[PDB]
Design an enzyme around this catalytic site. Structure first.
Site, PDB file in Angstrom:
ATOM      1  N   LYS A 145       0.798  -1.214   0.000  1.00 10.02           N
ATOM      2  CA  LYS A 145       0.000   0.000   0.000  1.00 10.02           C
ATOM      3  C   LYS A 145       0.835   1.271   0.000  1.00 10.02           C
ATOM      4  O   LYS A 145       0.636   2.097  -0.888  1.00 10.02           O
ATOM      5  CB  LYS A 145      -0.929   0.005   1.234  1.00 10.02           C
ATOM      6  N   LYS A 159       3.848   2.011  11.291  1.00  3.65           N
ATOM      7  CA  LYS A 159       5.166   1.972  10.679  1.00  3.65           C
ATOM      8  C   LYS A 159       5.308   3.280   9.891  1.00  3.65           C
ATOM      9  O   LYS A 159       4.379   3.701   9.198  1.00  3.65           O
ATOM     10  CB  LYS A 159       5.299   0.749   9.743  1.00  3.65           C
TER      11      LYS A 159
END
Ligand code: SF4
Lengths: 289, 289
Positions: free
Chosen positions: B15, B41
């Site tokens: 993504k 993240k």
């Protein structure tokens, strides 16, 4: 004395299958166990009930109006080895906290006297990826003392393990929530067992077991059952018994020592998952190099 | 007129790389864009800044005491094509709502006047797996109107897409949050394009683009950069321009129609990801069969 345990770990690595097989091995072994599923997907009790999907507390509360309106006989369902099975249901999309739905579930069972009723183990199968205050709530409300982290020799599953560890460190002072060990669900990468043992040592715990990749797992789970029920004399069935036995016998319950991102990458680089990055080509196009 | 967009989708399917490449193609194209990372993240701005990791609002707030103590020049960093880059930081493990930490970051930018300052696009790269109230907050607090779901022809990425869709349906009546389409990050499975076409059809939207698996993606990202910067005339770079162009040009902004689990399995079975299950062997051991 009932031992309250939880299996934390990220999705996509086979966590619920291992929770169910461990719990099956434990019932063959003579233990009275209850699985309380806390993942958004209802996968935690399917292999015990030979179910396509168990009815969750969340969806049955939606049917009966409020949670108090349903009877325990509709939530708790017994399967193989008389293993009791609850599935709490995911957060209702766009609204609701995953943590509130989980403690909603735990409190329904407490009042309905499911815990009190002779039980050796309670296993909560909880999602442990993003350890926000919500997925951390079984730890904070001290509903589970022995946490076992399923992970593998992969960057995000190791990162998730360290985050679950930071979660436990947060509430160390408030109660008895401790890390009982790491279970490695093998992805058949080369140094995987050693890597997870190395991570377990930096964290101050052990790798309580290595669960290998075996096609009997898939053969058994496509029949909606554990390897223990399906093929009791398989090689894998003894792996699950060895895990179940070490869990029972486990005294190593600790407050873990979480590592930095750099240290997580040292361990991944020396065990060969991560390549060493070459500084000179960063930001440079195919023209420069 | 600034278009506020969001890229929702689960982890492990690439993504953030697609968000960054789409945004790079869009800057080569003359657009003024800001990427606001919302995944735990910090991966959403790395390929634009040639960074190992960008300093998040979360970690710089931890340093300066409270969020108000830091300057915008330390949060917003410009990279390739002058693309502005913010990374809000994950929920701090064991505590907080991931959604509250994300909208706290958006409110910091609003006050510091980052939006006001000439901008054609805003792209929030948000996690969309478990769509709890936390991760649904950019939709509820109407910070993003055009949501594009990255997914693939895999059970959990499709399930995540449907959940993000249910999230949007929840807040349809409260505002202008709509589904602009599905982006398929190819995993090279056989009927993948047709499957996400069909998913998008049951859902009432389109598959706005198919991003193929190309090794140039990996070559570019190992240099901490987008394929658009790394090789402006690669085959993949035009894929990203084709996606960037369809997004700009898009008028298909819909309130989606979420499908059932059965329907998700019909689509996976007829496109060959899911095998048809044989009822007769369920609950039966290797002895019976
Ligand atoms: S605390 Fe976590 S599970 Fe609860 S609404 Fe927030 S992000 Fe979701």
């Amino acid at each position: 004395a009932m031992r309250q345990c939880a299996i934390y770990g990220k999705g996509g690595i086979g966590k619920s299958t291992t929770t169910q097989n461990l719990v099956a091995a434990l019932a063959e072994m003579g233990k009275k166990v209850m699985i309380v599923g806390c993942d958004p997907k209802a996968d935690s009790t399917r292999l015990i009930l030979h179910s396509k999907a168990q009815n969750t507390i969340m969806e049955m509360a939606a049917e009966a109006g409020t949670v108090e309106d349903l009877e325990l006989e509709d939530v708790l369902k017994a399967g193989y080895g008389g293993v009791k099975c609850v599935e709490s249901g995911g957060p209702e999309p766009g609204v609701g906290c995953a943590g509130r739905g989980v403690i909603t579930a735990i409190n329904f069972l407490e009042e309905e006297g499911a815990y009190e009723d002779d039980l050796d183990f309670v296993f909560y199968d909880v999602l442990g990826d993003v350890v926000c205050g919500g997925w951390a709530m079984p730890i904070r409300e001290n509903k589970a003392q022995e946490i076992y982290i399923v992970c593998s020799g992969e960057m995000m599953a190791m990162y998730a393990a360290n985050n679950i560890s930071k979660g436990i460190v947060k509430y160390a002072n408030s109660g008895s929530v401790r890390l009982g060990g790491l279970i490695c669900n093998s992805r058949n990468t080369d140094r995987e067992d050693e890597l997870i043992i190395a991570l377990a040592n930096k964290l101050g715990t052990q790798m309580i077991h290595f669960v290998p990749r075996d096609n009997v797992v898939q053969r058994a789970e496509i029949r909606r059952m554990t390897v223990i029920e399906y093929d009791p004399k398989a090689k894998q069935a003894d792996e699950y018994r060895a895990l179940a036995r070490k869990v029972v016998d486990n005294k190593l319950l600790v407050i873990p020592n979480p590592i930095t991102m750099d240290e997580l990458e040292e361990l991944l680089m020396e065990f060969g998952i991560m390549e060493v990055e070459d500084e000179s080509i960063v930001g440079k196009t195919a023209e420069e190099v």
